Design a protein around this ligand. Structure first.
Ligand SMILES: N[C@@H](CCS)C(=O)O
Ligand SMILES: [Fe+3]
Length: 186
């Protein structure tokens, strides 16, 4: 029974209930993420930016079932084209706008990865992806506004692949946390 999360803390409690089992009701998880109205005071602790690239800030470890984290995107910061390691990936905007570009899985043959579609994700919107859907790139193309997003991955993963847009070739990447539970983790 899904109720509106009143606060980020409330959201986290609700997520623990929704991931208490072995499976994931994606539509319910997306609905509750969308229903949380971003309150910057509640996540300022996690919103640690870097001048040169986007940062990943761990918020909750989900009792082992998921990682919940906040990503902070300076102006012009963006991601690789990447997958999600056979996991569920939810993305909710907390501040600003991000451009999500969708790509298909490349064929064995070397070829330009042509974008399938793109959308602008706006404050409080929640997107979902998984490997059966495809790949994506996420970018803050703003020249004037930093962006902040809330990501939920289930099961947790700390490795993924980056794809070369020119060829489709992939390379394994290990993701690091800029901070955990509000604490910078150099
Ligand atoms: N999965 C990426 C961000 C876009 S979903 C990450 O954690 O760096
Ligand atoms: Fe992603």
């Amino acid at each position: 029974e899904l109720l509106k999360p009143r606060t980020l803390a409330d959201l986290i409690r609700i997520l623990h209930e929704l991931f208490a089992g072995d499976e994931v009701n994606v539509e319910e998880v997306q609905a509750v993420l969308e229903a949380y109205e971003s309150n910057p005071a509640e996540w300022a602790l996690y919103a640690k930016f870097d001048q040169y690239r986007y940062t990943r800030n761990l918020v909750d470890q989900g009792n082992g079932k998921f990682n919940l984290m906040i990503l902070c995107w300076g102006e012009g910061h963006g991601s690789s084209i990447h997958d999600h390691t056979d996991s569920h990936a939810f993305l909710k905007l907390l501040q600003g706008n991000l451009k999500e570009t969708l790509f298909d899985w490349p064929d064995k043959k070397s070829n330009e990865m042509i974008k399938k579609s793109e959308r602008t994700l706006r404050e409080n919107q929640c997107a979902y992806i998984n490997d059966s859907i495809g790949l994506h790139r996420v970018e803050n193309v703003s020249h004037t506004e930093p962006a902040v997003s809330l990501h939920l991955y289930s099961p947790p993963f700390d490795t993924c692949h980056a794809f070369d847009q020119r060829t489709g070739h992939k390379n394994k990447v290990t993701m690091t946390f800029h901070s955990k539970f509000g604490i910078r983790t150099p």
